[PDB]
Symmetry: C3
Subunit: 114 residues, 3 copies
């Protein structure tokens, strides 16, 4: 999978090691090799959540399968837990959109995963 975090937390508040840690914990959570996981963090954003500019995040996780009710709950506990621990973001000011991609609709290395 690939995980993207957009947040109003400033760049200086993103701790060294954070992209690595996200890679490792997503690899572990999905039983996927870490060589396939992509991660992306976008700090310093102009965002509001419930009209407030307190720390918040808008995120996405795309996966070819391994998306569903229990699995997404597990992902959210893991990802909100990381965002709370590392970025000081309340889990109730985070949204994560989950996307179950078809292999034919994921481009990589001049072709797709189909």
């Amino acid at each position: 999978p690939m995980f993207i975090v957009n947040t109003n937390v400033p760049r200086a508040s993103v701790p060294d090691g954070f992209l690595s840690e996200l890679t490792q914990q997503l690899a572990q959570a999905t039983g996927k090799p870490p060589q396939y996981i992509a991660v992306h963090v976008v700090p310093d954003q102009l965002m509001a959540f419930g009209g407030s500019s307190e720390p918040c995040a808008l995120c996405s996780l795309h996966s070819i399968g391994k998306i569903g009710g229990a699995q997404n709950r597990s992902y959210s506990k893991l990802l909100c837990g990381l965002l709370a621990e590392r970025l000081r973001i309340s889990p109730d000011r985070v949204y994560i959109n989950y996307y179950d991609m078809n292999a034919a609709n994921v481009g990589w290395n001049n072709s797709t995963f189909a």
Copy 2:
């Protein structure tokens, strides 16, 4: 719902109250409490629309239901109105991608909305 605007309009052209205004207008438009609505504006982008770098916007609106033919036309009229009036972007240089998210595919507060 959550609304993201990416634009080549500079940060200084985004009016002070703009995130609050989007929050309140989207709350009114969907009959949702404003506490749930997230909004995110990304200015100064390197983008073109039709090959031109005249002001333009690429947007998304994610909602758990309340997405459909008529609802979406209404959203577009509302959101293009605000982008024209506040950011001085022509409606014919705006795209908005609408996503009807399943509740189980939206993470929040260490779980999902399911």
Copy 3:
């Protein structure tokens, strides 16, 4: 269509003419008028791919139709081609998510494409 590339390549590495070339190549790949094509490049991103911060990209292409097995393979070869030639990113460090949008789910000019 609309194509978005997020990359850790620095802004100064993105050559003059890159948005123009993407617009032109996407028009040719879909036979669609360039006047409707939108492109967006986001350099200097904090991203990793396979746990490495070597040059990489995460991309999206949204289109109303013209998405499918052979078409997406063709787009990937085109777009990885450009990202390798112009931004010096290895094709195997690019992901492109493809989205076949329903015309009623794309807003434009105060309405939708339905």
